[PDB]
DNA sequence: ATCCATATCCACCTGGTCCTACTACCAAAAGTGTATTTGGAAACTGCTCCATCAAAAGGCATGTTCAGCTGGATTCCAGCTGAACATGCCTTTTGATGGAGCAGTTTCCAAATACACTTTTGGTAGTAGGACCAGGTGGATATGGAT
DNA sequence: ATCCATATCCACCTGGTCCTACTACCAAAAGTGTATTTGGAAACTGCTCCATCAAAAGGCATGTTCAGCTGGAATCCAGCTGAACATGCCTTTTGATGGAGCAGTTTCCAAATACACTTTTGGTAGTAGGACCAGGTGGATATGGAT
């Protein structure tokens, strides 16, 4: 079986443009984009943990990695969404 | 009971992101918070991209997003263009741009 | 088969690039540049193909080759 | 007649900047990649999507290179790209 | 008074292209680094070798950039580098 | 523990220093505006790098920027540096 | 008896193995991988040290300084490509005046 | 108070130095550069091998992955010479 | 300003490429609950090296003058390249189809991991002691350039 | 061709710097042997999709002719920038000090892992049904440029 991010990309699409569809090739580009940014952030965090002689990747390493990778407004908005998600997650 | 995505109020998978971080050998261990933060950042980025792309689709009177709409969205946003500066979208074309040197008269 | 790129094709690519006039010695130059490009990427691709002990070059091999060239490509996997 | 040299040119600039289709014929390109690959390992086969991906990457690379080349020509206060422009570009990009 | 305009410049090219010493003054560069860094985060000290690393990196970058810039000027049939040259080089580099 | 205010230190990158750097790049003649342009260029180059550096610093919960922070910043920027660690 | 001498190498096979598993490149690391990698590393260092030693001898020196490494890698097409995105501290640049600027 | 034992490649590249130029020294900064070069090439090769393993759904870094990684990274003759040294050292190691 | 020849654009239409949707099936994934393990945060502190101070010497930045040759403006024309056209060759298309070979499944052993006991080794440290590199002075010889 | 003025250079030294070289201590690699676990090589093969060969139809490549206008060569001069020079500042250098804060060590406990048992889910494959758009068709109208 082959795993994809397609159904979640579609969930967010209907969440943000309810009457808008998406062609299959565009969805494949979206899945490649998600996998790409995933590998970039995860690799940046991995290196971050290595440089500080640490064995665990916390949400903190993910945050610093995001600040390293994303430009500016994207970085702060994404940091915001992430820390919001972790706080709302640990409150339950 | 409820998916960890719902615990973080997220559409993107928390369990899957945790498993892929688990198998990427990025470190020996990953804390419980990291996958929900990463899923949140990913969902945000896809949300921004799909937003701008949706705008580009409506501008050309189109119901569904095709690759060109993604290319216009990325290349017209300074931030996302910077993020995807070394990425090629297939069947995306280029921005309409004639150098103001060989124009009329 | 490098002569396959018919001068109108170069010219169209250049129009998409945003050029107005094209010298008569642009076409063979473009031929050479395209040749070294395809040589590098295809070499890496079929190296990935050999490591997988296969005889078919997959789309994923081209995606990996391009990715390590610094020319990441969305639209075909990965 | 009816048009002065170089306005149908801009017409083509707009035509192909509006669109996304590939601009090299697909089979001559496929022959090209088969030839080039035949010199690294023999008796090789290609997934159709592999040749398609190579064509997308090749045309993208060439279009960007023609952008920088055009910039080089305009910098010398000319409007016709010349191989010296392609070479100056590829030199500054680090491809040399 | 003796040499004509230009040849002393070729002398300086052969000279600085023969050696390796850093060419920006040390303390002005350190002050610039501390100013720039002070706008990102307050109370930031530096290992001396960190300022030296930033200086080595900066001068290498600027020297390479001047090479590309010179190529651009020569491409425009000039021998004088101008801001349009630096801008064309940084643009084609994707900076 | 009062410190003076750091300002305008980009002008410490003298026109002589920029001339030297141009000479090592093989530049023969330099127009009068180059210098300011150069500083502008230099400024952004430092800014970027220094950001990432102090980011690493901030992630290590340290207050001194180490040579290794600069080396990691430069490597990420795609300008790997040999001679200070790593 | 060490694996380095068993592999006929000066570079440390054991350290390359441990460092190999300390970076998490895969779940497992076969015993040939650190031997091969240590052999390749030793070869590359041998090459650069050879050309750089020639450089120091050219400028009548007795020990290699960073400039000699710079001339070594910048004058070899292949090493220059391998280190094309690398900056050698205190290496300087190669002598190169574009011809049109000459008398 | 038991300072961190910082490991280098210095004594090994020094051995290799006297094997090729027995009368030449190396300055401390040039040595530091050499250690940086070795750790760099190490990270690039091991990274490529890791990516290969993950691409082929494998959890083992064999000397094969190291080999084709070397072929991907090193240019031309360097690759062929390095590959030959890797094969020789492996056969000698598996010979005892 | 007039008019002709294309090129461009908006509206409407129609076939088929392409979406979503809804059913079922299900291995894998994801969650849960229970038990053991451990990375690394806190607290303390030994001590490296970073900031800052003073002092003084001269290397080098700054500000100015002056004139050489460079860039940029102008003019011209040779010939290079774009436009348009007729021809006709290929590319495209799509269709069927062997069969190469990618990929799914299973067996099973060479090789990797785990752990414990034994050596070996590589840094770190200090102290001695030489080679050699940097820089200062001086005195041939070249060389760019004015004649 | 002559020759001045200044830079270049070669040959040494000598002061201090920076490298190799000794002994020794030694935690922490690194080797080793044993036992236990398993990744993926090999072997078989079922289904995908890749290659190839056929057959039209016209889209678009090729080759030519012919004219406009663009590149490049030549000429001219305002003025921008290089070279030289006088002045003195503020960088470099040496050395000392106080203490920030880095980094080493121990304690402990919150969070991570390990494992088994259960519940949910995404995703795969068919199979219905519909809208969306690609490509014409028609005729209005804007546009380029020659009168
Ligand atoms: Cl966490
Ligand atoms: Cl040319
Ligand atoms: Cl300018
Ligand atoms: Cl192995
Ligand atoms: Mn400030
Ligand atoms: Mn034998
Ligand atoms: Mn219909
Ligand atoms: Mn512990
Ligand atoms: Mn001129
Ligand atoms: Mn004419
Ligand atoms: Mn078969
Ligand atoms: Mn020892
Ligand atoms: Mn010396
Ligand atoms: Mn000397
Ligand atoms: Mn002495
Ligand atoms: Mn198994
Ligand atoms: Mn002109
Ligand atoms: Mn004048
Ligand atoms: Mn303290
Ligand atoms: Mn479901
Ligand atoms: Mn249409
Ligand atoms: Mn019509
Ligand atoms: Mn008109």
From TrEMBL, chain B:
Residues 78-105 form the Histone H2A C-terminal domain. One of its GO terms (cellular component) is nucleus. The keyword tRNA processing does not apply. One of its GO terms (molecular function) is DNA binding. GO terms for biological process: heterochromatin formation. Residues 1-75 form the Core Histone H2A/H2B/H3 domain. Its main location: nucleus. The keyword Transmembrane helix does not apply. It comes from the Eukaryota. Keywords: Acetylation, Chromosome, DNA-binding, Isopeptide bond, Nucleosome core, Nucleus, Phosphoprotein, Ubl conjugation. It is found in: Chromosome; Nucleus. Core component of nucleosome. Nucleosomes wrap and compact DNA into chromatin, limiting DNA accessibility to the cellular machineries which require DNA as a template. Histones thereby play a central role in transcription regulation, DNA repair, DNA replication and chromosomal stability. DNA accessibility is regulated via a complex set of post-translational modifications of histones, also called histone code, and nucleosome remodeling. Belongs to the histone H2A family. The nucleosome is a histone octamer containing two molecules each of H2A, H2B, H3 and H4 assembled in one H3-H4 heterotetramer and two H2A-H2B heterodimers. The octamer wraps approximately 147 bp of DNA. This is Histone H2A. It comes from Xenopus laevis. The chain holds residues 15 to 119 of 130 of the full protein.
